[PDB]
RNA sequence: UAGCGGUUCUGACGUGCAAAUCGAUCGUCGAAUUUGGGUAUAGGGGCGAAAGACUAAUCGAACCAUCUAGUAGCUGGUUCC
RNA sequence: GCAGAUCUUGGUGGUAGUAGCAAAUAUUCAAAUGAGAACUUUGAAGACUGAAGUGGGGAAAGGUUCCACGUCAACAGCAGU
RNA sequence: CUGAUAACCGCAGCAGGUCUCCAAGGUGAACAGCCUCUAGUUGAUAGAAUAAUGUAGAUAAGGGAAGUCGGCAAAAUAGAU
RNA sequence: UGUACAACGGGGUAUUGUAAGCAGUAGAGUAGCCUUGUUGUUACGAUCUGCUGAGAUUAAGCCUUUGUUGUCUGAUUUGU
């Protein structure tokens, strides 16, 4: 890294856009039971294995 | 308040390292209002943030020590820790002599 | 009831910092001047002046002078006032010889 | 020596992302995947590894074409369009 | 010296800073040197200035899955009156 | 049907508020923020790494830590604005 | 952007491990060791007392290995002419 | 509210060992000068002498003190 492919950088883009909590409106929804974001990754605790 | 960013930008603008920038505590809130390099360049000119010029390292006892070695001091057997070849080699004394004759 | 009387002193730090480790002879000189001002003036909030902090740390951690000419003031407190109504405030006084001086009451005139 | 300081030297990769199964199981030196087996003509699948088939048989992805087969069988593979009667 | 190693204190640590580190002491230091990156060699197979050593914390023989709920004259347990 | 299989899974104990949080020489005063400052920020000191650096960049590897604003339940084995 | 006693690997913000370019003044043979400048830090739970026993350093009159399996650990010598 | 107690200061005792600063036909020599000498001076000069048995430190587990400055009723608990 710092000098990369495009495939790996594309996967950094997708793992960036996934790295956000629930939107607040999903909690108030009818018959919603998604309490939080469970597939959340952080760069310290879970390396993404590309 | 918090003045990390302003010290970073001040050292980056004035050119001197972070260990030499001055952020006086009287004007502190005004320095906390300046959040750009262009505002730092206005807080530099009027005298709010100055250089803190260099700690002096006077090579003067070096000059006295050198001048005293010039007169023929500091050259006994105990001010001398490398060998007679390590200080001034045999080869260089010879190359000085034999070019002179040549 | 006023008790605002400023007094100067010599504190003999040599018989206070005796036997203290060398990386603790200046900060314990600080923690000893706060106790000294508690013992004389009586109050429990003490403010050392930063010029006194320079006067302790001239010769590093372990080169505290033997005797420091202090000027201890006692003042009243304000601004959402603390647990004491009064405090002390210890400034240095800048003398040639801290040896040979007694204690002297400073007049405010 | 063979435990943690030798783990300190572990800065490379044997494997990179396979183009067919997207997995980081394509060996760099061997130039072959190890989970699917690209670039062979097949996908590696074994009856000893019954879980690996279950992880990658049909019905786990999108079914971008099979989803519309039974339904399209269900009419008898008609071509054209329907007519309009009323309302 | 740097580097590479790891000799003794059978020192420290020994529910550790560390699944083998720390500190002194020490071997070697210009070449049968040290090291990166690429590549080659794969399990009764490799590779070995050879110790049955090393082959990803595993090695007189790797790891994974399956036959496999393998076999057991041997241990243990075996539920109310 | 259950007391026991170094039983499986989940929870909870005494120990015990003890063992400890002791390498890398080091902290101190004032002000400001703030409900609250040994730990934040600024000024004044005192020092340390001493240019085979605790300095300037990069290869590998990580992947948005980069930078700003707001913020402190959680992590930062004390605290924390 | 970090490139490492917090951005990589070691279950973790782990005194370990990992490739290199630049690299100032003095003493000194020296890119050793100590001190400084440019640069960077002041981070590594703190306060008070400071007894047992420790770990790390030290010093011991007279004798001098009588200690122990063994002068192992320490001391001595140590540069240069 | 006391020939009390403390922080200082003074004195004794002690330890080290002669301070800072000034002076000096003291000073190995070496320059610069002049009437060039029969100590000819000026300057540089580690050191030496006089002041200097000085100066420093002296209680933290030394002694004493009429000198200077201060301190001296906060909480809590208890009976056959």
From Swiss-Prot, chain A:
Stretches for region Disordered: 1-21
Predominant location category: cytoplasm
PANTHER family to which the protein is assigned, alphabetical: LARGE RIBOSOMAL SUBUNIT PROTEIN EL39, RIBOSOMAL PROTEIN L39E
Gene Ontology, cellular component aspect: cytoplasm; cytosol; cytosolic large ribosomal subunit
Assigned keywords, A-Z: Cytoplasm, Ribonucleoprotein, Ribosomal protein
GO molecular function: structural constituent of ribosome
Biased composition (Basic residues): 6-19
Protein name per the record: Large ribosomal subunit protein eL39
Superkingdom in the source lineage: Eukaryota
Assembly: Component of the large ribosomal subunit (LSU). Mature yeast ribosomes consist of a small (40S) and a large (60S) subunit. The 40S small subunit contains 1 molecule of ribosomal RNA (18S rRNA) and 33 different proteins (encoded by 57 genes). The large 60S subunit contains 3 rRNA molecules (25S, 5.8S and 5S rRNA) and 46 different proteins (encoded by 81 genes). eL39 interacts with YIH1.
Keyword Ribosomal protein: yes
Coiled-coil residues: none
GO biological process, one term: cytoplasmic translation
Assigned protein family: Belongs to the eukaryotic ribosomal protein eL39 family.
Protein's cellular compartments: Cytoplasm
A Pfam family annotated for this UniProt entry: Ribosomal_L39
From Swiss-Prot, chain B:
Subunit: Component of the large ribosomal subunit (LSU). Mature yeast ribosomes consist of a small (40S) and a large (60S) subunit. The 40S small subunit contains 1 molecule of ribosomal RNA (18S rRNA) and 33 different proteins (encoded by 57 genes). The large 60S subunit contains 3 rRNA molecules (25S, 5.8S and 5S rRNA) and 46 different proteins (encoded by 81 genes). eL19 lies in close proximity to the binding site for eukaryotic initiation factor eIF4G.
Family: Belongs to the eukaryotic ribosomal protein eL19 family.
Protein name: Large ribosomal subunit protein eL19A
Keywords on record: Cytoplasm, Isopeptide bond, Phosphoprotein, Ribonucleoprotein, Ribosomal protein, Ubl conjugation
Cell compartments where the protein resides: Cytoplasm
Residue span of region Disordered: 57-84
Functional summary from the UniProt entry: Component of the ribosome, a large ribonucleoprotein complex responsible for the synthesis of proteins in the cell. The small ribosomal subunit (SSU) binds messenger RNAs (mRNAs) and translates the encoded message by selecting cognate aminoacyl-transfer RNA (tRNA) molecules. The large subunit (LSU) contains the ribosomal catalytic site termed the peptidyl transferase center (PTC), which catalyzes the formation of peptide bonds, thereby polymerizing the amino acids delivered by tRNAs into a polypeptide chain.
GO cellular component terms, A-Z: cytosol; cytosolic large ribosomal subunit
GO molecular function, one term: RNA binding
Domain of life: Eukaryota
Chain positions found as Phosphoserine: 29, 36, 90
Cross-link Glycyl lysine isopeptide (Lys-Gly) (interchain with G-Cter in ubiquitin) residue location(s): 20, 52, 59
Curated annotation (Swiss-Prot), chain C:
Keyword annotations from UniProtKB, A to Z: Cytoplasm, Ribonucleoprotein, Ribosomal protein
Listed PROSITE patterns: RIBOSOMAL_L31E (PS01144)
Miscellaneous note of the record: There are 2 genes for eL31 in yeast.
Gene3D superfamilies in the record: 3.10.440.10
Record-linked SUPFAM superfamilies: Ribosomal protein L31e
Cellular component, GO, one term: cytosolic large ribosomal subunit
Function: Component of the ribosome, a large ribonucleoprotein complex responsible for the synthesis of proteins in the cell. The small ribosomal subunit (SSU) binds messenger RNAs (mRNAs) and translates the encoded message by selecting cognate aminoacyl-transfer RNA (tRNA) molecules. The large subunit (LSU) contains the ribosomal catalytic site termed the peptidyl transferase center (PTC), which catalyzes the formation of peptide bonds, thereby polymerizing the amino acids delivered by tRNAs into a polypeptide chain.
Superkingdom assignment: Eukaryota
GO molecular function ontology, one term from the record: structural constituent of ribosome
Subcellular location: Cytoplasm
Subunit structure: Component of the large ribosomal subunit (LSU). Mature yeast ribosomes consist of a small (40S) and a large (60S) subunit. The 40S small subunit contains 1 molecule of ribosomal RNA (18S rRNA) and 33 different proteins (encoded by 57 genes). The large 60S subunit contains 3 rRNA molecules (25S, 5.8S and 5S rRNA) and 46 different proteins (encoded by 81 genes).
GO terms, biological process: cytoplasmic translation; regulation of translational fidelity
Name used for this protein in its record: Large ribosomal subunit protein eL31A
One Pfam family from the record: Ribosomal_L31e
Originating gene: RPL31A
Swiss-Prot record, chain D:
UniProt-listed PROSITE patterns: RIBOSOMAL_L37E
Subcellular location: Cytoplasm
Keywords: Cytoplasm, Metal-binding, Ribonucleoprotein, Ribosomal protein, RNA-binding, rRNA-binding, Zinc, Zinc-finger
Bound cofactor: record note: Binds 1 zinc ion per subunit.
Molecular function GO terms recorded: RNA binding; rRNA binding; structural constituent of ribosome; zinc ion binding
Zn finger spans (C4-type): 18-36
Protein name in UniProt: Large ribosomal subunit protein eL37A
Species for this entry: Saccharomyces cerevisiae (strain ATCC 204508 / S288c)
Organism phylogeny: Eukaryota, Fungi, Dikarya, Ascomycota, Saccharomycotina
Gene: RPL37A
